Design a protein around this ligand. Structure first.
Ligand SMILES: Nc1ncnc2c1ncn2[C@@H]1O[C@H](COP(=O)(O)OP(=O)(O)OP(=O)(O)O)[C@@H](O)[C@H]1O
Ligand SMILES: [Mg+2]
Lengths: 234, 238, 233, 73, 96, 213, 241, 48, 243
């Protein structure tokens, strides 16, 4: 029993896209909190052995010196998106000469989200939707903003989102602990408390990545040393 | 059940299933109303949020300085058809030095969404539009479907629980021609307030108004530009 | 309009067979009987002509075509697929003749015609050809008789049959073929081995014969065949 | 309107609208609607059918899978 | 008149179903049943019946008298990953 | 045989104050020795605080205006704001450079208020390079006008003088003079004169009369 | 079984089923009649109003395919507007290369031949759309052709398309028409429409009419408002009586 | 409707007869019926 | 041509083609890789020789570059197509950037070549997994492992292909810093790990070492039999801790 890649469900939405959403629930957990002080992105690495280097895993990547990102789902499919984001942000800097608004980058990445097409395209187009949800957090002229972008091309601004295999559980614990008046040090500590319940192994300095993006700084990933200091407090 | 896997197959009954379905993608979308006068056309859209910590997705997309649209369906498809219209109205400024008149714009959307309902393995665009424009024939509304039809309306509504609005709009279709600008938007809101559950109401964080007139290039109102229209609004009692 | 399919319809089965070629060989075995007999100074290609009323004009079509001044074909199987291969052969011969200014050798022509038929068992959205060609030719002092199959293979024979009852005819030929025949039997003996599979009365307009000696290939005029049909010549 | 008469319905109901709301329905499905409206008024705890019950019956007797991702408007 | 769909349970369901089947066997103090439900993708109720059996088995195979947190993560690995190679749910789910 | 350019004169000029940006050009559009028309401003308002001045081959002014005036809208839909002057200047450079092997033939003087709220002027060549300046003249009388601004606005080769900033009153009356003095000696300057003042309150346009000879 | 999934599949019967179905999508549309007289052609569409919300006389089914060639359609309306552009495009390439308004005998054979190319492959779907081309010239008289999904064109003196195809062909057979001036036909058309329409199966209707003949000097317009009213008054009177 | 048939006739309706259970294998279509099978306490006749 | 969609999403949220290509790896041969401090040893189990084949054409340890070698386990056919494109890449990079490739970078390109093949029309996934091994421009050792999905992690030690779940269970307990302190202890760690999943002794383990700034040496069969004698000698001098 086979159908196209572009079939509508009699229900009312695209078979593949409804499926690619399920591929997210297999992925790691990411939590992004938007503040007035900056954005923080926390994502658990989920190492599978003790023989793996807990460092060649990259689930937070710089897009530019003011737009972070966190991937959950099939991290292999992000490779194509991330590289389109960069070359987007750079081209916008090479023409208009000025940084790019965070919203515009996420829009330009979402235009690929629906782009598969078994035929009537190039011998190079995608065949299947991307298997990955993103958390672009950056700081531009509107202050900090954090966007969530799923494989449906629908992006939307959030004050605090969680994705992955603890989207249901974490999202409910963000609603109780979030409020407009935070600082960045309260958030990084708030998220790692939520991220410590929904992990499966103990929270080390080798089991998360933190990053922040602040008005008076760049995108700045916390190293293994600086992490020891905020897990001491918890 | 075998006539549902392509736009390419007809059904013994004389329909096409893949085109019927696509239109269910529209009834999943968020209610939206459009009515006109003889000097203004208005798009009132009920945005929606998928969480408590989250903003609402934009229903009204600015096209040109005399054309708005209100989507309802896959958003990825709505920005694929919006870039094509933005491109059609920059083709007209650049060649004829005039605004593209709306009737001839909706006829291009019609030629471009027709195509992939007749080629193999391509799909219809899963999005319905309401097109509020004003040119040298006064105001217009145009409803577009994924089937590729379209209509000139005097006041249309699409999306979810839109039928409740269509009746409100069909009882008051006589009064619309004589409204001032602020009186019209009241109708649109009162029609859009019949599409909600009975338990909640129109706030400033999930309503979007779009006005285009004879002397007023198409604008959009959000948050606290919407307050001068909810304030003054009748109470809807049950 | 269209693009065209891209995926081969000839596919391997669990056996290790290419079922499509196996079937296209069964079409071959429905076709009109054809015999071939290499002599020792000529080749004879004779064939049971098709007709089923008296309305057909038995001189408007030919099952024995000339490919070059020194080549010939008959076939066994689907008649439309034969006009396609006769026409790709005549062009192959003309590219060869345009580059070397020399008539294409008969070993060559069969080896290329075969590679066209091989292309249709591994191309997108086609079925194999439904014919077996029997290619005679006389170059370099010798005669030649080949036979290409819808598979694409080809085998040199000293005499063979194809089409309907080609197992009875290969046996009949196995005995009656003793090398060093004159060109004129291969005709006689050929016509005989059409008769071992033909029901009715043979006439000058009911079979078609073509010879192929040093002087070049030529279809035999109706008069000419009527004489060999003394069943004594 | 033929299968409602058996039961108590408010004067709220607007059959003109419901008919336009349904589509591709048979006499067997329209029949089922009224059945389902009354079943939603039985759960809610009232004794009258309002226009809102019929609206939820149509959603019920209309084939429709549990699509809880219908949040891409 | 009424068609009831039995879709695969969600996270919240799974957590519920682990309790319905495991409560009956002896388990160490602290089993995150909510973590065995994050750790299940789209699972049948009957996949979760099977998990609990095997958590019991490893406890029996090794001669201990109590299933631990490890025993589930291990038996949840065995019964889902391996056996998911030949599951119904993938294919049988479109006819649904 | 066929020559794809002709030189249609026109003189453009621009002064960047400290909260205001002048952009002023004659209107005479001439070809060869005839005077085609006497009015045809060389000044096109782009945003609310950005004027651009094209001068040179008038077939390319029209194209290069409609191209910028489009990639100006296009930008606004994707970013939901208007472009700054600092951006248009960069963008225009790429456009110009896009045709590096059959170039535009347009001298461009952009003048507007960048973000801080200060006068900014950008000067382009034909093939697309630009620096930021405090005043540039271009076009035909570019060699007439450039030394009277170096002196009055630049104070170059002077000593024992004030350096009090440039007054919105001393500018306009400065412009009106240098153009009356280029209309005597240059034959492509005359007829009228659009002065565009660009303050933070919009864009006014003042029309002055030159000699029609 | 599997003889309907493709336009490229004959059935054992002997007939392509995908074209059969297309033609049945026409039969489930409102009715359009054409009737050619001796100095013009008049068109008549039975456009249903499905709500009071659609603007009056808008989203027509009467195209201009060229400056002297009407096109009145029935069937799935999206594919209709697609043909109306292929036809405009042909009747422009013909004026370009041959320099004179295209003759309707030819414009028909070219638009049928384009519909036909869509019933051959599996990669496309046959059009769900029958339609009539009318035309007037002073060197050829009135001509009225009708195309269908198959890709067949046939000269006609009258015809109809749509859900009342049967009832309307009667009314035109019981009508002399090789002798009536244009002006007299329009009254007949209105009267025929009113008869063939059911208000017990549909709500109400708007009556669309088109000249193209000696009156207008070989152009094709829509009938002026005043003459349209006169044809509606004379049509209510023949239903009274 | 079998434990309290009075409340459906007082309202004036008639509850619906049949019920289709469908789902991927092993999701409690039978379990949910093994369930109603005993608690119902009314004649129960299942055919395979 | 042949624009079809080979890899589409399951309804369960997988990709069945990239999960089936995972099985074409498991039907491969074991290969391990441990990294020392001055030496990186990857061994492939089974030469596959039948006393008739050459040992020069059955090799499963090729060399992309000079500091970069790669062992694989899957379909020998596909692996040769990747390895080729990798060797091209390794020279295209010397042209445009003066330095030699680092070991991360030639991996990210092998992985990104395998990811594009599971999301393009017409193509089935590459059915190989890989250990990319090498030394950077700083003498640092590196060990990367890819798979059909087109993901890649570094490791300290690792095994792919057949019987790799067992060999990973032996390297958890045996990889310490009491081992791999010398060049002789790191080679003996690899051999001692393949001897757990080879059923014919040591005369069936081809084993290649790379040493700091020198090039890839494949250890001839004589040296490997010497090292297998030191292993078996050491399991009879563990009888001094059982008495
Ligand atoms: N929601 C649930 N709660 C508890 N157990 C469940 C649930 N769903 C399934 N199960 C378990 O699955 C087992 C089998 O389920 P059941 O046989 O009812 O599925 P089914 O829909 O009948 O499948 P089949 O089509 O194979 O008959 C039950 O014995 C039960 O333990
Ligand atoms: Mg069952």
């Amino acid at each position: 029993y086979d159908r196209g890649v572009n079939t509508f469900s009699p229900e009312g939405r695209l078979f593949q896209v409804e499926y690619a959403i399920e591929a997210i629930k297999l992925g790691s957990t990411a939590i992004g909190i938007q503040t007035s002080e900056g954005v923080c992105l926390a994502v658990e690495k989920r190492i599978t052995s003790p023989l793996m280097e807990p460092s060649s895993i990259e689930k937070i990547v710089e897009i530019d010196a003011h737009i972070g990102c966190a991937m959950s789902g099939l991290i292999a499919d992000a490779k194509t998106l991330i590289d389109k984001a960069r070359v987007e942000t750079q081209n916008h800097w090479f023409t208009y000469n000025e940084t790019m608004t965070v919203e515009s980058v996420t829009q330009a990445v979402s235009n690929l989200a629906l782009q598969f097409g078994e035929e009537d395209a190039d011998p190079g187009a995608m065949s299947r939707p991307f298997g990955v949800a993103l958390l672009f957090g950056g700081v531009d002229e509107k202050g900090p903003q954090l966007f969530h972008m799923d494989p449906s091309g629908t992006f939307v601004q959030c004050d605090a989102r969680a994705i992955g295999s603890a989207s249901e559980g974490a999202q409910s614990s963000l609603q109780e602990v979030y409020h407009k008046s935070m600082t960045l040090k309260e958030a990084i500590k708030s998220s790692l408390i939520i991220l410590k319940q929904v992990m499966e192994e103990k929270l080390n300095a080798t089991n998360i990545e933190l990053a922040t993006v602040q008005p008076g700084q760049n995108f700045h990933m916390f190293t293994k040393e600086e992490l020891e200091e905020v897990i001491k407090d918890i | 059940n075998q006539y549902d896997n392509d736009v390419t197959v007809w059904s013994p009954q004389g329909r096409i299933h893949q085109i019927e379905y696509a239109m269910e993608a529209v009834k999943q979308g968020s209610a939206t109303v459009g009515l006109k006068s003889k000097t203004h056309a208005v798009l009132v859209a009920l945005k929606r949020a998928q969480s408590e910590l989250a903003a609402h997705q934009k229903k009204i997309l600015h096209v040109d300085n005399h054309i708005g649209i209100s989507i309802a369906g896959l958003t990825a498809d709505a920005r694929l058809l919006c870039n094509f219209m933005r491109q059609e109205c920059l083709d007209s400024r650049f060649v004829f030095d005039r605004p593209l008149p709306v009737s001839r714009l909706v006829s291009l959307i019609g030629s471009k969404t027709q195509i992939p309902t007749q080629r193999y393995g391509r799909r219809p665009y899963g999005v319905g539009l309401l097109i509020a424009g004003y040119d040298d024939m006064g105001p217009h509304i145009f409803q577009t479907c994924p089937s590729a039809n379209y209509f000139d309306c005097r006041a249309m509504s699409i999306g979810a629980r839109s039928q409740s609005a269509r009746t409100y709009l069909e009882r008051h279709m006589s009064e619309f021609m004589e409204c001032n600008l602020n009186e019209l938007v009241k109708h649109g809101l009162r029609a859009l307030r019949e599409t909600l559950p009975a338990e909640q109401d129109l706030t400033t964080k999930n309503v979007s108004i779009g006005i285009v007139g004879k002397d007023l290039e198409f604008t959009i109102y959000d948050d606290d530009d919407v307050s001068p229209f909810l304030e003054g609004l009748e109470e809807r009692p049950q | 309009a269209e693009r065209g399919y891209s995926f081969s319809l000839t596919t391997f089965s669990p056996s290790g067979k290419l079922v499509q070629i196996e079937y296209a060989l069964a079409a071959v075995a429905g076709g009109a009987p054809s015999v071939g007999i290499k002599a020792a100074n000529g080749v004879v290609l004779a064939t049971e002509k098709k007709q089923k009323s008296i309305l057909y004009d038995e001189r408007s079509v030919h099952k024995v075509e000339p490919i070059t001044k020194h080549i010939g074909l008959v076939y066994s199987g689907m008649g439309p697929d034969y006009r396609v291969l006769v026409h790709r052969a005549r062009k192959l011969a003309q590219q060869y003749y345009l580059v070397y200014q020399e008539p294409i050798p008969t070993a060559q022509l069969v080896q290329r015609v075969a590679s066209v038929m091989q292309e249709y068992t591994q191309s997108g959205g086609v079925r194999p050809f439904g014919v077996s060609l029997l290619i005679c030719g006389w170059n370099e002092g010798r005669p030649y008789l080949f036979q290409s199959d819808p598979s694409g293979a080809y085998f040199a024979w000293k005499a063979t049959a194809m089409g309907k009852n080609y197992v009875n005819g290969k046996t009949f030929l196995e005995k009656r073929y003793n090398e060093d025949l004159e060109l004129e039997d291969a005709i006689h003996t050929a016509i005989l081995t059409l008769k071992e599979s033909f029901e009715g009365q043979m006439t000058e307009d009911n079979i078609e014969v073509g010879i192929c000696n040093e002087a070049g290939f030529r279809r035999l005029t109706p008069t000419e065949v009527k004489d060999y049909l003394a069943a004594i010549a | 309107q033929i299968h409602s008469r058996k039961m108590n319905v408010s004067p709220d109901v607007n059959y003109e609208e419901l008919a336009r709301c349904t589509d591709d329905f048979n006499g067997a499905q329209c029949k089922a609607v009224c059945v389902e409206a009354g079943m939603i008024a039985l759960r809610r705890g009232a004794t009258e059918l309002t226009h809102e019950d019929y609206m939820e019956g149509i959603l019920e007797v209309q084939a429709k899978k549990k699509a809880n991702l219908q949040y891409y408007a | 008149d009424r068609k009831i769909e039995f879709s695969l349970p969600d996270l919240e369901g799974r957590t519920h179903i682990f309790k319905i089947h495991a409560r009956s066997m002896s388990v160490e103090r602290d089993i995150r049943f909510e973590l065995l439900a994050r750790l299940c993708p789209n699972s049948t109720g009957a996949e979760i019946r099977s998990v609990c059996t095997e958590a019991g088995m490893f406890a029996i195979r090794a001669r201990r008298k109590i299933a631990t947190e490890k025993d589930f993560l291990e038996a949840v690995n065995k019964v889902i990953k391996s056996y998911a190679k030949f599951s119904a749910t993938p294919r049988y789910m479109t006819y649904n | 045989r066929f020559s794809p350019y002709v030189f249609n004169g026109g003189t453009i000029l621009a002064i960047a104050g400290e909260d205001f940006a002048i952009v002023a050009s004659d209107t005479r559009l001439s070809e060869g020795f005839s005077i085609h028309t006497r009015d045809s401003p060389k000044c096109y308002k782009l945003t609310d605080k950005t004027v651009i001045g094209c001068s040179g081959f008038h077939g390319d002014c029209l194209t290069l205006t409609k191209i910028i005036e489009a990639r100006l809208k296009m930008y606004k839909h994707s970013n939901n704001k208007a472009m700054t002057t600092g951006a248009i200047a960069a963008m225009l450079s790429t456009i110009l450079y896009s045709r590096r092997f059959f170039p535009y033939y347009v001298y461009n003087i952009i003048g507007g208020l960048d973000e801080e709220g200060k006068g900014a002027v950008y000067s382009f060549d034909p093939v697309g390079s630009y620096q930021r300046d405090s005043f540039k003249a271009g076009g035909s009388a570019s060699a007439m006008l450039q030394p009277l601004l170096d002196n009055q606005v630049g104070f170059k080769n002077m000593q024992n003088v004030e350096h009090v900033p440039l007054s919105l009153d001393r500018a306009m009356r400065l412009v009106k003079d240098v153009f009356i003095s280029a209309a005597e000696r240059d034959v492509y300057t005359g007829d009228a004169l659009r002065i565009c003042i660009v303050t933070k309150e919009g864009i006014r346009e003042e029309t002055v009369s030159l000699r029609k000879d | 079984t599997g003889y309907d999934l493709s336009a490229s599949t004959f059935s054992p019967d002997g007939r392509v089923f995908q074209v059969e179905y297309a033609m049945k999508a026409v039969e489930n549309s409102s009715t359009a009649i054409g009737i050619r007289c001796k100095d013009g052609v008049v068109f008549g569409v039975e456009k249903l109003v499905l709500s009071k919300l659609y603007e009056e006389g808008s989203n027509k089914r009467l195209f201009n395919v060229d400056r002297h060639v009407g096109m009145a359609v029935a069937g799935l309306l999206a594919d209709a507007r697609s043909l109306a552009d292929i036809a405009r495009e042909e009747a422009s390439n013909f004026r370009s290369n041959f320099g004179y308004n295209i003759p309707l005998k030819h414009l028909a054979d070219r638009v049928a031949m384009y519909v036909h190319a869509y019933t051959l492959y599996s990669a496309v779907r046959p059009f769900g759309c029958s339609f009539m081309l009318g035309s007037y010239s002073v060197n050829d008289g009135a001509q009225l052709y009708m195309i269908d999904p198959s890709g067949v064109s046939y000269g006609y003196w009258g015809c109809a398309i749509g859900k009342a195809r049967q009832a309307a062909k009667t009314e035109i057979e019981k009508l002399q028409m090789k002798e009536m001036t244009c002006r007299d036909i329009v009254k007949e058309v209105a009267k025929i429409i009113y008869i063939v329409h059911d208000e017990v199966k549909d709500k109400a209707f708007e009556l669309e009419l088109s000249w193209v003949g000696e009156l207008t000097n070989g152009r094709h317009e829509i009938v002026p408002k005043d003459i349209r009213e006169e044809a509606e008054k004379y049509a209510k009177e023949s239903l009274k009586e | 409707p079998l434990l309290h048939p009075e409340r459906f006739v007082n309202l004036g309706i008639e509850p619906p007869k049949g019920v289709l259970l469908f789902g991927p294998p092993g999701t409690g279509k039978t379990l949910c019926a093994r369930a109603v099978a005993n608690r119902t306490d009314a004649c129960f006749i299942r055919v395979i | 041509s042949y624009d079809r969609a080979i890899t589409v999403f399951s309804p369960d949220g997988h990709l069945f083609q990239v999960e089936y290509a995972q099985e074409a790896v498991k039907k491969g041969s074991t290969a391990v890789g441990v990294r020392g401090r001055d030496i990186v040893v990857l061994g492939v189990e089974k030469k596959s020789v039948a006393k008739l084949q050459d040992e020069r054409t059955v090799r499963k340890i090729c060399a992309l570059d000079d500091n970069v070698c790669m062992a694989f386990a899957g379909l020998t056919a596909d692996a040769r197509i990747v390895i080729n494109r990798a060797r091209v890449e390794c020279q295209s990079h010397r042209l445009t950037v003066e330095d030699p490739v680092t070991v991360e970078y030639i991996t990210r390109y092998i992985a990104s070549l395998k990811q594009r093949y599971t999301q393009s029309n017409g193509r089935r996934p590459f059915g190989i997994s890989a250990l990319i091994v090498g030394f950077d421009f700083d003498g640092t050792p590196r060990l990367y492992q890819t798979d059909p999905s087109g993901t890649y992690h570094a490791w300290k030690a690792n095994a792919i292909g057949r019987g790799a779940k067992s060999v990973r269970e032996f390297l958890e307990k045996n990889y310490t810093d009491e081992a791999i302190e010398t060049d002789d202890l790191t080679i003996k760690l690899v051999i001692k790990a393949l001897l757990e999943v080879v059923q014919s002794g040591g005369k069936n383990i081809e084993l290649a070492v790379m040493r700091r700034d020198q090039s890839l040496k494949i250890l001839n069969p004589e040296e490997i039999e010497k090292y297998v004698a030191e292993i078996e000698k050491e399991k009879e001098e563990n009888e001094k801790k059982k008495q």
